[PDB]
Design an enzyme around this catalytic site. Structure first.
Site, mmCIF file in Angstrom:
data_model
loop_
_atom_site.group_PDB
_atom_site.id
_atom_site.type_symbol
_atom_site.label_atom_id
_atom_site.label_comp_id
_atom_site.label_asym_id
_atom_site.label_seq_id
_atom_site.Cartn_x
_atom_site.Cartn_y
_atom_site.Cartn_z
ATOM 1 N N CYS A 116 -8.746 -9.926 -0.869
ATOM 2 C CA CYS A 116 -9.380 -8.648 -0.562
ATOM 3 C C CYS A 116 -8.564 -7.468 -1.072
ATOM 4 O O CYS A 116 -9.135 -6.415 -1.371
ATOM 5 C CB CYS A 116 -9.635 -8.515 0.940
ATOM 6 S SG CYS A 116 -8.286 -9.012 2.009
ATOM 7 N N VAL A 125 -10.470 -4.543 -3.147
ATOM 8 C CA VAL A 125 -10.523 -3.154 -2.699
ATOM 9 C C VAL A 125 -10.047 -2.211 -3.800
ATOM 10 O O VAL A 125 -10.631 -1.141 -4.004
ATOM 11 C CB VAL A 125 -9.722 -2.976 -1.395
ATOM 12 C CG1 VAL A 125 -9.664 -1.514 -1.007
ATOM 13 C CG2 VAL A 125 -10.366 -3.772 -0.275
#
Ligand code: ICS
Ligand code: ICS
Ligand SMILES: [Fe+3]
Ligand SMILES: [Fe+3]
Lengths: 522, 477, 522, 477
Positions: free
Chosen positions: A152, A156
């Site tokens: 992640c 992001v």
């Protein structure tokens, strides 16, 4: 103290009187613990219907989820390809966790690498990490292919995997011909099964999208099989065996069974088995593609139908009698191979086992959870056994899947008391099994804490756990089992009926109290 | 053995790397000399890992949530972010505790905000506030809340500090924000540091003005024991038998009241220097509490530790210490007599986290065993300073070892036993070499103290001398 | 009373207050029951060393035996031949019992006939019964062969089976060409395994004794396999699979696996599968004969070596790691076929499971019972796992077998606390597990009453039963399992380690008392 | 229907037999006519089985040890002979009891002399005496011993009667010799008769001179209920609710004191006429106790039975009977309302031992079900006398049916459900016909009484309407 001839580990060592006294002193003197009466009252309250209402009003808090993040599925998919290194673009802690999770489930070595992005990559991106990591991985572990997923962190900051890999190739960090499929696997979307789907679609696209010109559907006389996120080795094995018995040519795409079951013969085999690159390149030439777990193979289905032009059959997961029948019949229709007498006999043997234990199975109430395809297959088989699913939970399910399960339930009288929950976790399920008690739970190792809680209410309220699913951490070698096909149905039937009988034996063991029913013959 | 042979092995292993990776990894492998005191001049540590090389290191969230904060039993620890991190770390570490789980203890539960795309795009502070209200409603007996940030929290512009301040002031509850995003640092160690800072800033000083707790000259705290398999309990019993009063243990079987009571003790007993040195030094500066490292691994280290600790107190404690040593002497002597002949001469290699690679060597030597190699995932240079004088001459040292490196080293050295974590276990079992998990004690233990030593000796014997290891070669091949 | 929506069976129906009060009234008023304090005192006494000393002084009383009579084994052997009707010369009650016993173990039909001798035959013999019964059986059930055994009635009156059958043939009751092998199976000698041995020797003699002139050892390039009394279908299946993988031609003599596993497809198949008469006639032409359970195949061994002139290898039962290795190597030497890579990999996978589970298996203490070959194979495997057999019981064992097991035990340090008992029953074993408590029992369903008794002493004294062996009446479909070869070893290892972990989970489930050790990961 | 069709089916089935077997079996198959109350003119029974035809019958020892004597809980029953008989019959029959097994109850244990060759050659009387001494030493709370002879005992001329007399006099214990050798008779029925004779000769009259038992006008005994699945308890509760006092209960959950107290009751309630008519008639002649048959299978039969029993006593019992009937009416009415629509119209065939093939018919008809065929293993002609008037016109009757016969009859009639024993169950399950065990209640029950009726109805529905039966045909076949 210890006795050299009978050494005690933590249990029962800490039940010795000196340890009990010391722990009581600790609690009384320094822990400022709530009084035991308060603890009992709050626990009793957590078992109530009003507490369940509060619990089901949750909108922001998740407690004890029954799913994981996408890159775990991506890593499992990558593991199914020959001499392939799963490579997770992002932070190394994720890879430590993925490896340990799979280690504990499979009791087998799990190979996976990261490019160890740190705070610096949060402002400059991870391009340098990708270049150096691809070079290091290829040089050190000598893979034929590197399959790239993402954590992640990378998602992001928006790291362009395609640009990074292409630049790594142009700048000579890895050869231009070295296969590096990639997939974006954002952990804040879907779950581990979604990550498997994304990784598989990435690999299939990488090998087939640009070479479709010379592809002719059906020219290799095979059927492609896509198993999805599968953590039972017996499932891969049974699909292969069933297709081999029919004389059906097939290509299992993403086959990790060898690399997750290497022998202990004095050497460490980092790679073994797995789908070859030649099989993936030739897949569009197959007669058709069958998806074993369609409810998390949607993106793969879109690619296979749109690009390979395969008319992917509408098939459920081959679990239980009827869905195994339908799978075999569709395979027979696609390949023109008749269903052989061995499979007919195996089906008859499963029916035999059903007719024998039906009296013990009938009417039993179950709470169950897991991934969507596994859950719906289990529900269908339970309805076939005359069992009553009551609490059907799928944390990573969706509305369309829930509607399909509801249609399955409505087709049988045994589905009348069933409710399907999506987006609910194991704390919700704890409340459910307190307020509408089933006979058993079917789920993964995380259900043992629910069994503990129900026992704490009282022996009459305890709901035993039947471990089927993923992960199973507190039993050994259950990952070798089978849940698909007639063989899997047989194993599940045996597990269920013998769990029932074991509970009955436990309840009737008391001498001169309940052992009038402690029958020798059941 | 044979120093020149070991540096030869280091070079031969290193040849496979590209030049940048090889030059980096060369600084992290050294041949030990116990005379050397400044480990910086030989081995380098606490650096970033090489990409693509299959390190064993975790992240800062593991060091903070998994290690320091998670064991605190009466608090609720929120894994703030997407679902993975809390799930993989749920109950994976055996930090034992006494409590009623889900009612007044919460260690083996997984509380998370389960971030979705909308929480990534539009932030998660409002979801955090609603989550905290939900926690208060559903777990009223909780005694505080910690927020353990996962990677996206730091990446997106979320401000959990202000949410924690506002909500804590609104509900009169201690809410501890922890910025332990996994991309920070290079391993679990910065996780330790961040967690210790959170303890210091939000919990440690709540009772600075309160003087109602009654104190004694024999008040101690156990700092940096996480009670793996009950280790901290097995140590606490010895300390209390010596006549000391253990006010607090950090953080295994720990409670928030014990943390808040720690500033009232007379001596801080530090087991894991690596993880809790930050708070120990802070406590010495601000409260004047001295601290000392101790070692309860095996009878020799345990006896030395008990004697030093007792020496920190009056004569009555020293007499009690001698009584404890005399009382336990026959038990560990019987253990030695039974298990040393079965392990004498056997050679062990280790690879663990920040403390145990050096801390357990005394117990192996008490069973007549030799540590021919040891190393750390995330230790610092002071840790290697202690390790070198602990280890023997011409032994191999490896910092942040890669999977390939450790496999090659093992294939050359051929130890009789390897002690490491879950990600190496099955590799070396397939290689036909006995393996003990040195993080979880292979779901056994405790190993600390006199009672732990018997379990340690039994475990090493049962694994090292197991008949399975003689059957890896089929009789026909 | 009953509630229509939740109907209760005997358990828990008879725990209702009205039933409890009625039963208390019955006991108080009319049963003249010993006071409960006396009952408790006598039970406690039955758990003592002094009681054990009295118990082991028994010379005439047998209590809860762990064996059956010969004709049961004879019937099982006869069932393994194609279209063969087991025919028991003697009393019909014996056949009712044999059929029910096998029905309850296998959950399948079992075909067997009697000639229903009565007191009239006690006075004048059963020759007429034989003639009419052979004619009736052949006319009605149309078998290819009738295999004749005897009950103890026929043995005591000395019925000459040979003369009776010959007279039946000459007087036209059955055709002279119709095969009617026979065997004397006196139930006051040996046990069921002895009956299997006698029946098999009778069949082999009937088909081969008079036609040895044209027989040439090794001319058909096969190895004969004699399985003995076998009640796990997986065992037949695994032997066949292992020999097929090696490319070894074989002839399994007495194969009942098909007739005991017919499918439920709408028709009743009285016969299925089984060794053919041509196989039995051609058996002397094989390279050699392997006996899978030598310790009850002695008479068969004498016939095979003396008449067929086969040099029967000295092999143990292929159970565990070492004995499976030795069996495969002997088969390789006899047939000249190398051991293939698939079997090597399977062996390595078993070794991998052993290394994965050794920490939980090590030092565990077991009491076990069963037939001699099964018992010694289980003892050998337990010693390979690092487990400690403590009480080894074989009711139908002999002194030579006991010496062989003692030699096995002395070869391992893990055998130092083991004692082998022969001629002892399950009441003896009850005393043993009270006075020298093991961790578990491995045996058949009759051990559940011992578990009941040990629990009655207290939860800390309870010895859980692990059901391996014959008969298993209180669990479903365990007769499908495997105990031979690497696959059987794997199944047994899984069963053992998961029984251990299940017990541990049970003992650590108590909240705030013992659940500090209720680990997710084991 | 079509009596002619059924008679033709009988002939077609019979054609396969040899001449003598066909002529014999013709007498044992008949088409029912309810007006025909002299069953001997129609069907024949209680004859020897035809050799080689796969009968279902057991033997005398089963009828005596397995049926009558074995359930007596506080006695020890010795299987005298070789090992097989006691082992196959150990705990195979669910004659439920309350006791502490191995201490003061012994039903599910297997005591045997385990005859060896030397016992066959030199006799077994001395082994029997030593065995009895060992029993007394090891089971001191036993209240009597029975010796159940297996086939060799009668064949070798052993005198167990003299041993029993001598040892019983020596130890002041009741030792009951039973000559139930399996070759005697033709089925379990002579076993019943021999066992009843043993009860009469050695147990029943021990208290003929004892007048210390207090009696009431409402004393009854339940004779011939063996408490399968608790049947006798579920019946006893109804009797006691009616105001009667059940002094004795033969033989399920029975004790020797209850048998000895039976001669003091006012009325004997006979459930199984076939097995206990001998002792019931003896008791009428010797003690003047009247006896009557009753039937607690299903609400209609149990209501009729309760009213008939209450009619034998004064008005207070009759009032209590009406109260019991009123109290239970909603329960069985709710059962009927729930399960009759699921079973209405379905046709059943039965084959059981000596009582139930006619006794369960009323229960089946209370759920709207028809019995299109029934038969017995070992019934006598009075049993068929009772059976004919309860079965429908042109229904099939079979005595001592062979496996082939019953299979062919079922193949033609095609009932919706079959009720029989374990040796037929899997045969007809493989033919795709639902099957209920009617001996053991398929490890379910009780079926007697109002509480038993609910279990009966649920069981019949769950088996008859089970989804498994619709899956026997593969979709591609
Ligand atoms: S805290 Fe540290 S890796 Fe000091 S992160 Fe790690 S329970 Fe290790 S060597 Mo797992 S610095 Fe503790 C440790 Fe040591 S989790 Fe445990 S065993 S003594
Ligand atoms: S005693 Fe008889 S065969 Fe009357 S031997 Fe048999 S427990 Fe049957 S039809 Mo099993 S004459 Fe009882 C009987 Fe009926 S064992 Fe039970 S069910 S009512
Ligand atoms: Fe493994
Ligand atoms: Fe079956």
């Amino acid at each position: 103290s210890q006795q050299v001839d009978k050494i005690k580990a933590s249990y029962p060592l800490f039940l010795d009187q000196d340890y009990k006294d010391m722990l009581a002193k600790k609690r009384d003197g320094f822990e400022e613990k709530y009084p035991q009466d308060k603890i009992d009252e709050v626990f009793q309250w957590t078992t109530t219907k009003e507490y369940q209402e509060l619990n089901f009003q949750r909108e922001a808090l998740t407690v004890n989820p029954a799913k994981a993040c996408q890159p775990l599925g991506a890593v499992l998919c990558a593991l199914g390809f020959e001499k392939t290194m799963p490579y997770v673009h992002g932070s190394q802690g994720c890879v430590a966790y993925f490896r340990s999770y799979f280690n504990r489930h499979f009791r087998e070595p799990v190979s996976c690498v990261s490019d160890s992005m740190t705070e610096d990559a949060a402002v400059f991106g991870g391009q340098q990490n990708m270049k150096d990591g691809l070079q290091n991985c290829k040089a050190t572990y000598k893979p034929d292919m590197i399959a790239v997923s993402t954590t992640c962190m990378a998602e992001v900051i928006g790291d362009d995997l395609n640009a990074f890999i292409n630049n790594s190739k142009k700048e000579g960090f890895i050869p231009d011909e070295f296969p590096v499929p990639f997939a974006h696997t954002p952990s804040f979307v879907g779950s581990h099964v979604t990550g498997w789907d994304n990784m598989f679609e990435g690999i299939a696209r990488y090998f087939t999208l640009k070479s479709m010109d010379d592809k002719v559907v059906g020219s290799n006389k095979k059927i492609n099989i896509v198993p999805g996120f599968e953590t039972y080795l017996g499932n891969f094995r049974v699909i292969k065996r069933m297709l081999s018995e029919m004389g059906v040519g097939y290509s299992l795409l993403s086959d990790p069974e060898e690399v997750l079951d290497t022998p202990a013969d004095g050497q460490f085999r980092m790679y073994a088995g797995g789908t070859t690159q030649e099989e993936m390149k030739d897949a569009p030439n197959a007669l058709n593609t069958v998806l074993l777990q369609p409810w998390h193979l949607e993106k793969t289905k879109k690619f296979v139908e749109g690009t390979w032009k395969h008319e992917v059959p509408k098939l459920n997961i081959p679990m239980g009698l009827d869905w195994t029948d339908e799978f075999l019949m569709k395979v027979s229709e696609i390949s023109g191979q008749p269903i052989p007498a061995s499979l007919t006999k195996e089906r008859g043997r499963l029916v035999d086992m059903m007719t024998d234990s039906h009296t013990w199975l009938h009417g039993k109430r179950f709470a169950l959870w897991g991934d969507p395809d596994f859950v719906m297959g289990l529900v269908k088989f339970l309805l076939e056994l005359g069992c009553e699913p009551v609490h059907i939970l799928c944390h990573n399910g969706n509305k369309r899947w829930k509607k399909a399960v509801d249609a399955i339930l409505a087709a049988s009288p045994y589905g009348k008391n069933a409710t399907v929950y999506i987006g609910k976790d194991l704390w919700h399920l704890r409340s459910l099994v307190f307020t509408d008690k089933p006979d058993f739970m079917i789920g993964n190792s995380y259900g043992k804490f629910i069994q503990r809680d129900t026992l704490h209410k009282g022996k009459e309220f305890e709901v035993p756990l039947i471990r089927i699913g993923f992960p199973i951490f507190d039993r050994h070698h259950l990952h070798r089992s089978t849940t698909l096909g007639y063989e899997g149905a047989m194993q599940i039937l045996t597990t269920l009926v013998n769990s029932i009988l074991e509970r009955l034996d436990e309840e009737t063991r008391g001498m001169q109290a309940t052992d009038y029913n402690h029958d020798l013959v059941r | 053995m044979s120093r020149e042979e070991v540096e030869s092995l280091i070079q031969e292993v290193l040849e496979v790397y590209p030049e940048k990776a090889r030059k980096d990894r060369n600084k992290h492998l050294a041949v030990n000399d116990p005379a050397v005191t400044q480990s910086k001049k030989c081995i380098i540590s606490n650096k970033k890992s090489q990409p693509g090389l299959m390190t064993i290191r975790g992240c800062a969230y593991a060091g903070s949530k998994g290690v320091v904060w998670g064991p605190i039993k009466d608090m609720i620890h929120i894994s703030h972010g997407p679902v993975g991190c809390g799930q993989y770390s749920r109950a994976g570490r055996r930090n034992y505790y006494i409590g009623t789980t889900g009612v007044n203890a919460f260690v083996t539960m997984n509380f998370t905000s389960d971030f979705q795309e909308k929480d990534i795009v539009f932030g998660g502070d409002k979801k955090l506030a609603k989550l905290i209200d939900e926690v208060e409603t559903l777990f009223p007996l909780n005694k505080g809340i910690s927020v353990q940030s996962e990677c996206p929290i730091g990446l997106i512009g979320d401000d959990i500090e202000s949410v924690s301040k506002v909500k804590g002031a609104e509900l009169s509850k201690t809410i501890v924000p922890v910025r332990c995003e996994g991309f920070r640092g290079v391993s679990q160690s910065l996780g330790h540091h961040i967690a210790n800072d959170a303890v210091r800033d939000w919990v440690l000083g709540k009772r600075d003005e309160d003087t109602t707790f009654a104190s004694t000259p024999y008040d101690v705290a156990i700092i940096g024991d996480y009670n793996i398999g009950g280790d901290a309990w097995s140590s606490r019993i010895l300390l209390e038998e010596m006549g000391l009063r253990c006010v607090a243990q950090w953080s295994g079987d720990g409670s928030i009241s014990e943390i808040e009571l720690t500033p009232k003790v007379k001596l801080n007993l530090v087991h894991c220097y690596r993880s809790m040195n930050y708070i120990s030094r802070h406590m010495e500066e601000k409260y004047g509490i001295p601290w000392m490292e101790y070692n309860f691994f095996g009878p020799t280290k345990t006896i030395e530790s008990l004697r030093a600790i007792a020496a920190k107190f009056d004569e009555s404690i020293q007499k009690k210490c001698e009584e404890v040593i005399a009382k336990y002497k026959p038990e560990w002597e019987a253990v030695v007599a039974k298990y040393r002949p079965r392990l004498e001469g056997k050679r062990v290699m280790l690879y663990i986290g920040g403390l145990r690679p050096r801390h357990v060597i005394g117990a192996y030597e008490d069973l007549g065993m030799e540590v021919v190699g040891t190393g750390y995932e995330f230790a610092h240079n002071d840790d290697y300073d202690r390790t070198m004088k602990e280890m023997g001459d011409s032994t191999l040292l490896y910092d942040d070892v890669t999977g390939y490196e450790f496999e090659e080293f093992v294939k050359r050295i051929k130890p009789d036993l390897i002690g490491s974590g879950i990600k190496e276990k099955f590799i070396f079992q397939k290689m036909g070499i006995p393996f003990r998990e040195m993080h979880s004690w292979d779901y056994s233990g405790p190993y600390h103290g006199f009672d732990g030593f018997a379990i340690f000796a039994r475990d090493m014997d049962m694994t090292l001398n197991n008949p399975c290891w003689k059957k890896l070669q089929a009789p026909w091949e």
